[PDB]
Amino acid sequence: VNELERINCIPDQPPTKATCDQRGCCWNPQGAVSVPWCYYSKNHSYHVEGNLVNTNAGFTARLKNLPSSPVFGSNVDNVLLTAEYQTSNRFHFKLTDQTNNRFEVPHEHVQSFSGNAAASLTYQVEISRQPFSIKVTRRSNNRVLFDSSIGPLLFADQFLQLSTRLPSTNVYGLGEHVHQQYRHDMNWKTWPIFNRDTTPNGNGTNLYGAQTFFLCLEDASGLSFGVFLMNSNAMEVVLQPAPAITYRTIGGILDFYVFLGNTPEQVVQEYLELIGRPALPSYWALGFHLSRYEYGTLDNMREVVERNRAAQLPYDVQHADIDYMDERRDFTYDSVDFKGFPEFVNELHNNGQKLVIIVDPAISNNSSSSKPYGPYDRGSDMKIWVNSSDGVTPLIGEVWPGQTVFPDYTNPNCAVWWTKEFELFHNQVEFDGIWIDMNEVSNFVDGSVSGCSTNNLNNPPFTPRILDGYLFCKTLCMDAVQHWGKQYDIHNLYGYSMAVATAEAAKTVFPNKRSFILTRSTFAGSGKFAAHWLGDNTATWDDLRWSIPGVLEFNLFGIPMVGPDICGFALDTPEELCRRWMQLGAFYPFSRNHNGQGYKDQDPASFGADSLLLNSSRHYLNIRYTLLPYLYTLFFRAHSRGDTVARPLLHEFYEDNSTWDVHQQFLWGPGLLITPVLDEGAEKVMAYVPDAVWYDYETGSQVRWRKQKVEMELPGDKIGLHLRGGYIFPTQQPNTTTLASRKNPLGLIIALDENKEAKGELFWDDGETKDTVANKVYLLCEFSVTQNRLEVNISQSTYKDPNNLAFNEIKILGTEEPSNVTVKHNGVPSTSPTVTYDSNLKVAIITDIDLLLGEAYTVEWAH
Ligand SMILES: *[C@@H]1O[C@@H](CO)[C@@H](O[C@@H]2O[C@H](CO)[C@@H](O)[C@H](O)[C@H]2NC(C)=O)[C@H](O)[C@H]1NC(C)=O
Numbered sequence: 001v002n003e004l005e006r007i008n009c010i011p012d013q014p015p016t017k018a019t020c021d022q023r024g025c026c027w028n029p030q031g032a033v034s035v036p037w038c039y040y041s042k043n044h045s046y047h048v049e050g051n052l053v054n055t056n057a058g059f060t061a062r063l064k065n066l067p068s069s070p071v072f073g074s075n076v077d078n079v080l081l082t083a084e085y086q087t088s089n090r091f092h093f094k095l096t097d098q099t100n101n102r103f104e105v106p107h108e109h110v111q112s113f114s115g116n117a118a119a120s121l122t123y124q125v126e127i128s129r130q131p132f133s134i135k136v137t138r139r140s141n142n143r144v145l146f147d148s149s150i151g152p153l154l155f156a157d158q159f160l161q162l163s164t165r166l167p168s169t170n171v172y173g174l175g176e177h178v179h180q181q182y183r184h185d186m187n188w189k190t191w192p193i194f195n196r197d198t199t200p201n202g203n204g205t206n207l208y209g210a211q212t213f214f215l216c217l218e219d220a221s222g223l224s225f226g227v228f229l230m231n232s233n234a235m236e237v238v239l240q241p242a243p244a245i246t247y248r249t250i251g252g253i254l255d256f257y258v259f260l261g262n263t264p265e266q267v268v269q270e271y272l273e274l275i276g277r278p279a280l281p282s283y284w285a286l287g288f289h290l291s292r293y294e295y296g297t298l299d300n301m302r303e304v305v306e307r308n309r310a311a312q313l314p315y316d317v318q319h320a321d322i323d324y325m326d327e328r329r330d331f332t333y334d335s336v337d338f339k340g341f342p343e344f345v346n347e348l349h350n351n352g353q354k355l356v357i358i359v360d361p362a363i364s365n366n367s368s369s370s371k372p373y374g375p376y377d378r379g380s381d382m383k384i385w386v387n388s389s390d391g392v393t394p395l396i397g398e399v400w401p402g403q404t405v406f407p408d409y410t411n412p413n414c415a416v417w418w419t420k421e422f423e424l425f426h427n428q429v430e431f432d433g434i435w436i437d438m439n440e441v442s443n444f445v446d447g448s449v450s451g452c453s454t455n456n457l458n459n460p461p462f463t464p465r466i467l468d469g470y471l472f473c474k475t476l477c478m479d480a481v482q483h484w485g486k487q488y489d490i491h492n493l494y495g496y497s498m499a500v501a502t503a504e505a506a507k508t509v510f511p512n513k514r515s516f517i518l519t520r521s522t523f524a525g526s527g528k529f530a531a532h533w534l535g536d537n538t539a540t541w542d543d544l545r546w547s548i549p550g551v552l553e554f555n556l557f558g559i560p561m562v563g564p565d566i567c568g569f570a571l572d573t574p575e576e577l578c579r580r581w582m583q584l585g586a587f588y589p590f591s592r593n594h595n596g597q598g599y600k601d602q603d604p605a606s607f608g609a610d611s612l613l614l615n616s617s618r619h620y621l622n623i624r625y626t627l628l629p630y631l632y633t634l635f636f637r638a639h640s641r642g643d644t645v646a647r648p649l650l651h652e653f654y655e656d657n658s659t660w661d662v663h664q665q666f667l668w669g670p671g672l673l674i675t676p677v678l679d680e681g682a683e684k685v686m687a688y689v690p691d692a693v694w695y696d697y698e699t700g701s702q703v704r705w706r707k708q709k710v711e712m713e714l715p716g717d718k719i720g721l722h723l724r725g726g727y728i729f730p731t732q733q734p735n736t737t738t739l740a741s742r743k744n745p746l747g748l749i750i751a752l753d754e755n756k757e758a759k760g761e762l763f764w765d766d767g768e769t770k771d772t773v774a775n776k777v778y779l780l781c782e783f784s785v786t787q788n789r790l791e792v793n794i795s796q797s798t799y800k801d802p803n804n805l806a807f808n809e810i811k812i813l814g815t816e817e818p819s820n821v822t823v824k825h826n827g828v829p830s831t832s833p834t835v836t837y838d839s840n841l842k843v844a845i846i847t848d849i850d851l852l853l854g855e856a857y858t859v860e861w862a863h
């Protein structure tokens with residue numbers, strides 16, 4: 001055996017020969033570091049029994065275990081393989097127990113397949129029988145994508161494992177972790193997945209969410225594929241340099257999907273087609289968000305709001321953390337420290353801003369006739385709590401307010417209880433959106449206030465390498481009971497069900513509106529309901545750096561609205577770090593400055609009315625706001641087609657192997673390259689400039705660089721921002737709120753490619769109504785430049801903004817002097833616009849023009 005292909009047979013202890021012999025595995029301690037000493041033999045596991053059966057959907061096979069005494073509990077002697085050719089580019093197979101039903105994820109979006117195998121498959125599937133393996137190859141070039149033959153299938157009641165060889169080491173995805181780089185380290189790495197409230201630090205632990213999807217770029221042609229495991233039990237994923245990946249889970253079934261595409265963006269599109277495309281955000285949620293844990297009093301909160309408004313900082317959203325509550329209890333506010341909370345909210349609204357309030361899932365069980373607590377009383381009447389293993393007594397744990405019970409959001413009546421809590425509280429405080437936190441679910445005691453019984457659920461045969469080494473650590477007992485099943489099976493689904501329920505609440509509380517939900521814990525599919533933030537980071541330069549792969553991975557996962565706490569939640573932030581982070585932070589899809597309890601202020605205005613940090617912050621936030629129409633259109637494409645929003649360079653530049661591991665730079669969509677300074681003391685950044693024409697965003701000048709590493713000069717007040725030739729970017733003059741900015745004139749920036757062509761598009765709707773896309777109430781136009789001519793072409797025209805918006809400026813980059821500019825409307829001329837030309841920079845600006853939004857125009861020039 002090649003040592004890189006050994007599949008570790010002793011994942012559960014230090015390897016020894018005795019155990020190896022006992023398990024019937026192979027023993028060879030003569031390998032390199034991390035190479036498994038004890039590994040599976042060539043004939044371990046299952047074989048196909050008899051013949052495969054053609055079905056309407058694909059085929060089934062019966063798999064029979066070649067006998068062996070129990071290692072990690074009761075083995076499954078007869079396995080059923082069911083394979084479904086669901087679409088031309090999506091294959092589904094599951095391995096179940098022939099004789100017994102087992103837990104299967106009750107996903108809100110994925111449905112079972114009915115009817116017949118798709119025609120025109122891009123993939124071919126091959127089963128081997130002695131021993132069992134499954135292989136998926138790309139039909140066009142015979143590339144083997146999925147091939148399980150490298151290792152055994154293991155299928156015990158609490159230990160399920162399958163491995164696959166990979167065509168390349170360009171592997172991206174899995175979560176939620178701090179990987180520290182974007183392209184996977186394939187050198188014997190294990191990543192546990194089990195939702196858990198822990199710090200996103202350098203330790204490589206399981207964090208708040210569970211994401212099994214990864215994407216593999218097969219080669220420079222762009223051909224790519226993805227694999228998703230629909231399984232919500234604690235699990236770990238093991239990467240090795242064969243290259244290969246192994247999924248090892250402690251329950252449920254092995255339910256896999258394989259996705260093929262011609263490009264990385266196509267794989268993401270196929271994945272999101274299956275699990276659910278992300279929600280289209282409220283346009284205001286794309287503005288800047290400010291927050292902290294423990295303003296302490298409303299006066300303090302209002303003081304921060306007011307200095308940042310007086311600074312003229314673009315600033316749409318204020319979040320209120322648990323300090324607003326009465327003794328950290330949901331659905332109350334502190335009538336002394338937060339006295340006047342409703343008036344303050346009116347003041348936010350009057351200034352065009354929005355209030356987002358935190359809501360935790362755990363509910364104080366401290367209620368008496370003397371001092372009742374309505375949410376507990378109402379929830380108990382509805383009997384909607386998670387129960388102890390007895391099935392009938394609500395489980396008791398401890399969170400912010402003290403002893404608490406936990407809502408069972410898998411119960412349909414829990415969403416009705418939850419909705420009523422919000423409608424009641426909203427009548428007192430008119431919040432605009434909801435931040436759901438501690439929803440792993442996070443418990444300050446292990447399991448419950450009485451601990452956990454010793455049983456195969458709380459103390460399973462195998463425990464993946466999760467933080468602290470026990471499943472119920474800082475969460476619920478694994479034998480706790482909910483409508484969807486036992487905690488052991490549904491733990492990873494708690495935050496997911498909470499988001500579904502919260503989205504359900506929003507149908508009543510904000511009728512017909514998208515509102516905004518931000519969640520900590522996620523499962524596959526969570527992006528359909530909620531934004532995500534990367535959690536309780538730290539004010540260090542490492543955390544700044546680690547944020548970029550985190551944002552990119554969540555964009556693969558269909559949660560494009562994701563960002564960390566800008567400036568760092570834990571710790572006082574240094575001015576230089578916070579300045580650099582604010583600069584980068586202006587370009588995260590979710591942009592929120594958030595700070596932990598007790599640390600020095602890190603709101604931009606706190607650094608000084610005339611400070612460099614505040615000037616640079618306002619500068620780059622104004623750029624962000626100017627580009628909101630482009631960012632919003634990217635979100636429209638995520639929502640409607642499944643595209644990423646913050647995008648790895650490799651998704652556009654995959655033909656260039658220099659981009660395959662780039663993670664200190666990223667794109668907005670196809671067209672905008674962001675190059676932050678990420679090193680302490682630095683005024684330069686080593687950056688890659690891909691193989692395109694690029695223009696400096698601010699000056700419009702063409703950089704000399706192309707397809708090369710450069711040291712980009714970036715002084716204290718600068719971040720690198722470059723526009724890609726070939727693309728047209730719609731813009732709107734900024735203001736300090738999106739409420740106000742949406743009323744301003746629009747602009748186009750045309751970045752010409754080598755052929756003096758460019759293309760772009762603009763989506764426009766009312767920015768807040770839910771399902772404007774499904775119900776087709778929007779504007780979509782296309783811009784295309786092909787020498788001497790700009791065409792504005794309208795493809796969907798069912799929204800007309802009543803604010804009478806128009807493009808009143810067109811900036812053309814990389815152009816020779818335009819002359820004799822004409823404007824035709826519906827092909828009818830026409831008014832002669834002003835043109836300014838900078839011959840040194842090759843930039844033309846067309847002004848004194850008024851192209852109505854939603855109308856077709858031709859603009860033409862000579863040279
Ligand atoms: C950005 O914001 C708005 C409102 O916040 C707007 O202010 C208004 O502008 C009008 C002057 O042209 C006034 O008639 C009106 O009283 C004023 N309201 C205020 C200050 O509360 C700004 O004009 C707008 N500016 C930009 C650049 O779009």
Ligand SMILES: *[C@@H]1O[C@H](CO)[C@@H](O[C@@H]2O[C@H](CO)[C@@H](O)[C@H](O)[C@H]2NC(C)=O)[C@H](O)[C@H]1NC(C)=O
Pocket residue numbers: 382383385386387391392393394408481482483
């Ligand atoms: C948790 O325990 C409660 C009892 O405290 C269960 O409540 C039941 O709720 C249903 C639906 O309203 C009623 O029809 C039952 O009669 C209730 N039982 C009792 C004993 O009062 C609830 O079902 C439990 N939840 C789970 C998931 O087991």
Ligand SMILES: *[C@@H]1O[C@H](CO)[C@@H](O)[C@H](O)[C@H]1NC(C)=O
Pocket residue numbers: 201202203
């Ligand atoms: C890992 O966690 C420990 C606490 O167990 C912490 O002190 C340490 O700094 C973390 N390591 C890294 C590399 O961030």
